[PDB]
Symmetry: D2
Subunit: 462 residues, 4 copies
């Protein structure tokens, strides 16, 4: 036989090497810019971030840390990771004498589990926001039947705290009481579907009374934190973890911030740095994904610009404006508003489940996600970061609410005519002219705005 020439296999563009995958990426590109993307955890990152993500940085193995690698060839990888770490501190206004950061986690879930491994022993106790109350899997999750779902609940001992059953706010009194009975070694704040800000000072007061470490998972609001538009968890938390692909508008990666230097009121100093770095490598991960680190460095510089602070301001205002429109139609929002990037829409007063609204919205190129509410999820979660990154403002998000209003009206019209069971409901989705009209208006409205990451003019499917 004969080996392929480098020019054939190694330099030929994707559109020629693999038409199938190229065609599917092009279809996904159109889907992203011809619908309304309301997944609260999604964003549209920049072309610059994407160019660093798709680069020769993927070829380099660089196990270890800058200045203490396991092998050579890391002269420029070290500068990239050092730039990424220093830019990570600048984006969140942290002094390098009081804070450090590890930028090697592959994603948010590796970042959280590495933080747990660093400061906790197996079976140590952890408290996190309950999933039906707005928490995340990695904060601990086991079912009513006792089945341990999350790895946090498998390798550690978790116990959730809940929001108030009626107001929807975090019950800080019941949080403190459970923390005193349970005595966790680590308390986690932050969540995935909580529509209000966090009282980190009260969390610090509870952690000090029970003797726990305080960690904040700011994955969802990290972009708002960098722009100083929400409460800063660094004022009170020992460790802060985050994703970088949500409101921060970067690549899919994770970071772990940790305190260093003198402790607040012997002459004790913090002992997190070595534990956190060792937990990431050599304990849990292998070689870093340097293409993610380089792309993250780009995203962190953009997050420090004045234009980004205006983006975070706009995300909050769009979420509020959208929430005001929905409540003006009589709809119920958890806590009756929002202070961040998302709204949590209670659908139980309409006799609807999140599944039905999400399915019909998806048929209209409106991507939301069903989400549990306090108490077959009875709500949908709606986020503003992604569509705001396309340039939408308050008036545009009121139009989104109008589309959502039309979609729920069609959901109720279908349910009233065919039935409450899924098999009955599905009958109304086949050959529905009103759905096809709603999708047409979404598509035309979505095409009105720009799209970052790629050029619509160069798209395959226009």
């Amino acid at each position: 036989s004969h080996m392929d020439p480098v020019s054939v296999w190694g330099n030929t563009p994707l559109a020629t090497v693999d038409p199938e995958i190229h065609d599917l990426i092009e279809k996904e590109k159109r889907r992203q810019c011809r619908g309304i993307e309301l997944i609260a955890s999604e964003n549209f990152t920049s072309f610059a971030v994407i160019e660093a993500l798709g680069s020769a940085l993927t070829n380099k193995y660089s196990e270890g840390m800058p200045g203490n690698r396991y092998y050579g060839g890391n002269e420029y990888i070290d500068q990239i990771e050092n730039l990424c770490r220093s830019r990570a501190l600048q984006a969140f206004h942290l002094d390098a004498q009081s804070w450090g950061v590890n930028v090697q986690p592959y994603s948010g879930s590796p970042a959280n589990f590495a933080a747990y491994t660093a400061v906790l022993n197996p079976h140590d106790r952890i408290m996190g926001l309950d999933l039906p109350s707005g928490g995340h899997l990695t904060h601990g999750y086991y079912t009513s039947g006792g089945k341990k779902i999350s790895a946090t609940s498998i390798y550690f001992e978790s116990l959730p705290y809940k929001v108030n059953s009626t107001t929807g706010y975090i019950d800080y009194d019941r949080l403190e009481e459970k923390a005193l009975d349970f005595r966790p070694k680590l308390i986690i704040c932050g969540g995935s579907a909580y529509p209000r800000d966090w009282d980190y000072k009260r969390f610090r007061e509870v952690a000090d009374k029970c003797g726990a470490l305080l960690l904040c998972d700011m994955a969802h609001t990290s972009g708002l934190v960098a722009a100083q538009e929400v409460n800063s968890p660094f004022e009170y938390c020992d460790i802060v973890t985050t994703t970088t692909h949500k409101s921060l508008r970067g690549p899919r990666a994770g970071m772990i911030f940790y305190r260093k230097g003198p402790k607040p009121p012997e002459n004790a100093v913090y002992d997190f740095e070595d534990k956190i770095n060792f937990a990431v490598f050599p304990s849990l991960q292998g070689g870093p994904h340097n293409h993610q680190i380089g792309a993250l460095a780009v995203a962190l510089k953009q997050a420090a610009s004045p234009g980004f602070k205006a983006y975070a301001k706009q995300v909050k205002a769009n979420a509020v404006a959208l929430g005001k429109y929905l409540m003006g139609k009589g709809y119920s929002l958890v806590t009756g508003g929002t202070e961040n990037h998302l709204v949590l829409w209670d659908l139980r007063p309409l006799g609807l489940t999140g599944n039905k609204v999400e399915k019909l919205c998806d048929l209209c190129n409106i991507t939301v996600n069903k989400n549990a509410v306090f108490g077959a999820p009875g709500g949908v979660r709606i986020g503003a970061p992604a569509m705001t990154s396309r340039g939408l403002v308050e008036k545009d998000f009121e139009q989104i609410g109008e589309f959502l209003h039309r979609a729920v009206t069609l959901t109720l019209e279908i349910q009233k005519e065919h039935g409450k069971l899924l098999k009955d409901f599905n009958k109304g989705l086949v050959n529905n002219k009103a759905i096809e009209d709603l999708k047409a208006d979404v598509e035309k409205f979505s095409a009105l705005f720009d799209m970052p990451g790629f050029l619509v003019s160069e798209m395959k499917y226009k």
Copy 2:
């Protein structure tokens, strides 16, 4: 006021971030103007890189194709389904007997997800000892008892070793340890083992002691796909792998698992699929990195080509030719040869440590890595995949051996002139004309070959 989308979102990297753009360009030159001999490294294709840097990074798709948590996944599902079916085809697996999860972020997440699926916390694991060629994720604790690897933190690990004299895996001591220790899981595969694995013997040991058998084929997965080494799928219950080494894809992981009827209690069937998929999500990971999955799908298509089988053949032949050249100069290789992509070079007969040779080689743009040998590591590990991907053949790898020979000769001259201690050795690296002469010859030799992934002609830093 918000920035216009065209300004922040569509502007090329070279304008948005000159600092990072310049550093990527410098790393591009380093990759194509030196000799890359890290056995775990490769140079992937531009096609893989174009899929890696694409709008697929924007999509959240928690769950599995056909079983997602939310919508918008019409095209993501087809990409992951294509990736899974191409993974089975690339390794010649029947879909009724094998399944695969392609969501692991990397190789270490892939191994820990497999452990979580089939093991309870503190269950016992046996893996190849690190000084014998093993990997961290197979278990590692220090002399003091400090648990380094997460495998040794959340599970109970015990290593097995190569034969103290031959350097081959001691299958007799493996079986003896397996019966004393009674592991629930035995791991085969390694990072610096220069021979093939007897998976049939591992199955005999696993059946005698009652353990599951997992193979971590990360390093030789490309050779396995091309059927140039023994296939672990013939005997192992689970096969994990990276996709960025000899497979020449993006940085990702996969978990292969058996399906269907068991081989001779009743008509029992395998029970791995649901446990493995659940362990990846929702247990350990969050949303998959769909840009990795799409790039992996491209890599798996390329791995099924006739050109890739010829590449795997060439990697093996280059490793032999390099090893044959080194032994002709009197140097010592562990097991006295190789049957895969790498050679393990024993430096103790020369009175050298792996640290010194690696440091001087790096000053000449020759990237190797110090590596423990059976027993301050006394060896260096050298791999053929990366330079073979640039088009080098046997004669070119014999010149690489000449460069290595020159480097070790300079290392001994420094040690004889300044001393055996590292601080003494460093004195010989300051303003060394012979090192700078070797660096110049490496650069000129490296510039002779093509480079996948990007165009050398469009590089920022020329010559």
Copy 3:
């Protein structure tokens, strides 16, 4: 030369070891010349003591009757079989529905053996909080998170509490915690709880959350045998107990477990017997203490007599009469009374701590113990079994309350005169004529009654 058997082996203790003989004689006088109010203490019979000190201590008999590891157990087997059948008869249990293991060395080994039988390491357990009246073996960790009890070291425990105002068990907060925490095992029973237990409600909570239900009836086992309190066998899967408290036997433990068909998946039967017996031996214990088993068999026969049911009735009536007397003086009892063998005396309304009252009472040969109350413990626990075994009735226990009243009065006089701090309090104990006067009145009152276990007439230290 070896000593003759008659010299070392047959000589009485009074000659072999005068030092220890003298100390036992002094302890004999202390036991019958003071007021013993430790709720967990009793005075067992001479018959029990004769079996306890017998040649049964010489026999090794690892295993179970009819399933031993070696021979010579013809008579040991009959003794253990008698002990087991008498254990079921004493608590009115059908042998087809209940079994019992009588080999635990004490109560704490009995509880930990039950945990080992039905739980895996780190499984979750709920037990009565120590400040609410619980016991160490039900789980205990400090404010700092330090795991004190072995139950909290090898398992994951979480306490439930009494109502903050009434002092009764908060069954609503119990169920709420059981659903959040999801324990595999819920423990009922306690050491200082002055009311009866609603085992039916515990069964409803255990069934709703999916837990096993165990009762530790150590303190009230004598009252249970005489059917003077609620029976935990009606609702619990497992019942553990000591045998030296209200049961008035030797220091040993037992584990009762359900057998036979389950109450309404299929025709399921209980699976406790083999797990519990295996947990005791060979898992946790070695050879049983057959002298304890023989003495226990004697105690269980005595516990089945009509005289024992009258003793249990009297213990309850004495506790009420003592508590009624204390409340007539204005003192505060937790839950304002009792339904069992003890009273829990709240001293915080008097501005006193349990430590001070216990110290002054001990100087007067009145043995109580400081005990936490809901919330430097602010209470003392007082029990009726021991003094009731000496023949005291209600009028005699009202005199005991008068002694306690005098003791607390002296405690307050010292605190008012010297101070609230412990170092201040100690100043009032030096050469206190009122304390010495109270001690004299306790001695004269204590000498009025008989004493089981030994003959007061043959004591070494008379008067």
Copy 4:
């Protein structure tokens, strides 16, 4: 109704209160003095020990330690426990500045598990002598199938070391190699059926090379240790646990010895005392069994007498003399002799199992126990302490060997005539005149010697 008077229920002798149990104790008393007791773990303790064991000390609750109890009334209990501890140190020639002891363990298995809990965390690694090689359950045991039997193997991670497959001695080279692969936190020496002395110095050399603590379980030879007739484990071990009812000839209890004071070649001191005491109480046990502690104090004083050192010398000589007689008949002993209180008799060369010899011996009032040998146990374990306590010397133990020789001859005669299967073998035990003749000669021989603990003249069944 009416309560029983104290004189009736509380002062009446056992023979009247419970004739059934009294009759069974009397039958057990005769069985003990009219047969040959060769269970290596059994002894006959003194009447003085028994009088302290059966005393009013059983009525006292005394949770805690002397000088730091939880409640009052402990003036005399404290003196008894303090006497017991100081006598424990004297019996083993320990300086109180270098060694402490806790005398509260209920038995040997509680003593070992309390020591493990004190110095180890759950799932820490332990190495102990394999059961087929002469080890004990509490040192760790899991089956070939992987079933975890011992609580040591359930709550900790155990791995056994073995004797040499041919010589029967401990393989110290393979011990060191396994310790270096496995890296235990605790190494246990001592065993239940090992017929030779221990090289504690080599055990210390292995423990120091791998970084482990060294514990000796001297339960079986504790009497020989007190009399300084075998190697002392205190010279090299960090912790020493023991029972008190075997060769020490005391009550059924346990003790934990631990090092204190300056360490051997900073100015570090030992940290065992607080950990060991806390593990016993409040961690694992409740109130001490003060009747056991008082009886133990008596036994420890007797163990310090010159008569006891002569007893330990005689136990060793009786075991050797018995072993010499058996080997003179062609029988096989593990390691071909003994250096302590027992012999391990290999029955496989005779085509016999331990079950058959033990069953036939038991029918002749000869109590041995089947015991695994290196490799359906193929051996029997025979001990000298109990019969030596009755005054038997070398000539008497050669008569025991003659009885054992006759018993095995009858076992082979039965097996040759009826078969190797248990059902075949049992046929030869029914109405066997030779067995009844052997039992008659054992009974007459056993009646020739005295019996401690009780007066044969006062027995019920003579």
